[PDB]
Design a protein around this ligand. Sequence first.
Ligand SMILES: [Cl-]
Ligand SMILES: [Cl-]
Ligand SMILES: [Cl-]
Ligand SMILES: [Cl-]
Ligand SMILES: [Cl-]
Ligand SMILES: [Cl-]
Lengths: 215, 215
Amino acid sequence: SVIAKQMTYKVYMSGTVNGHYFEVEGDGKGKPYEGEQTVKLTVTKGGPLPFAWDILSPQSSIPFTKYPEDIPDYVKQSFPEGYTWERIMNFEDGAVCTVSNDSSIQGNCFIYHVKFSGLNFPPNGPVMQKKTQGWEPNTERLFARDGMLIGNNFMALKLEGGGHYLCEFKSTYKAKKPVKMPGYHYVDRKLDVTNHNKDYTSVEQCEISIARKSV
Amino acid sequence: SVIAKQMTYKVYMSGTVNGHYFEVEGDGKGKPYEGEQTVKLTVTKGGPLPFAWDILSPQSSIPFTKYPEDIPDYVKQSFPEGYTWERIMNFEDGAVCTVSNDSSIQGNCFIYHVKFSGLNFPPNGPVMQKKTQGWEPNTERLFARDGMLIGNNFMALKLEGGGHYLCEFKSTYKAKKPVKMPGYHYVDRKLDVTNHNKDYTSVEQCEISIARKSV
Ligand SMILES: [Cl-]
Ligand SMILES: [Cl-]
Ligand SMILES: [Cl-]
Ligand SMILES: [Cl-]
Ligand SMILES: [Cl-]
Ligand SMILES: [Cl-]
């Protein structure tokens, strides 16, 4: 396979949030067959960001998902040709983000190019006031349709003071060549910001992702 | 506690689907602390139903959910006063259902009164053409807000021929008196039609529901 037991990745992300332009670059590493990975991000343009970092954390790596042998692994099969993904994030206060990725491979390093567009975040809401405290551990429902893998997730951000701020994800993963399609299944994830500087111009994230066929 | 290790229930359900009125009565039993239950339904008015039975199967019992000791059990705590629930089902082809319940207790028997309103099912879609083949095993995301328990579930019906027909649930459970609120958690369920007659005027269902605090 072109996917080694230890791999690196490079992320080039750019976008807007309520009209504010930014660029981010990241250096990641992980164990694709263990579903373990980490990434170090730097804001390279438009920093310090005037919005919560948490809306960007799920946008910087599906090859690093642990798949049991009896569940086809859509994204690993897509390489070396690679894949793209598209995502809609619908927040409960009306904000909407559209995110797209292109993923390729060069040797032992995946290359991700990400475009992020977020808007209608209320100026006094938790994203513009930076009151979020990370995503709850979560489960993505996945199934195959028309050669694409479609995921849906009822996500939530923890808030300063104890509440939750809800977000619905719809993710569409598109392999660049046909692959063996999986059945109806789930992916459980833990995604955490494990380090950052005062203004989130440098951020470190760790993610564990494990696929399964229902409890 | 007023909830015994073995209990029964009676269901009185009525409603409309694309303007077609019906009534259903059910007799259920289960082990509330094991999350195990079964129910036998009879269509008492408006039968045979011109729509897929599956849209009604999740509307006939939250007391029968296995809760670990370290997760407060919102619905069991609500008794003997009881609780109500409200549900919105949004199907991917535009159909929408609104469902409400009132649940009370009389001795060893819970009493459920259910009102179902479903509409905009396309006449050539899988519900009106009876092409559904049961719900996939699923996971409800649950959290506490304003004294209510709010659940969300990315559900799917299996289809004749191999596809899936998606439905999003939003359920709101409302205890009639204040109870100890749980943290952010999940409930996994298997719900199956285990017997039926030719025209689904008699149906038997079995459900296993188990709460947990993330994999
Ligand atoms: Cl790692
Ligand atoms: Cl497919
Ligand atoms: Cl850092
Ligand atoms: Cl039982
Ligand atoms: Cl609350
Ligand atoms: Cl039967």
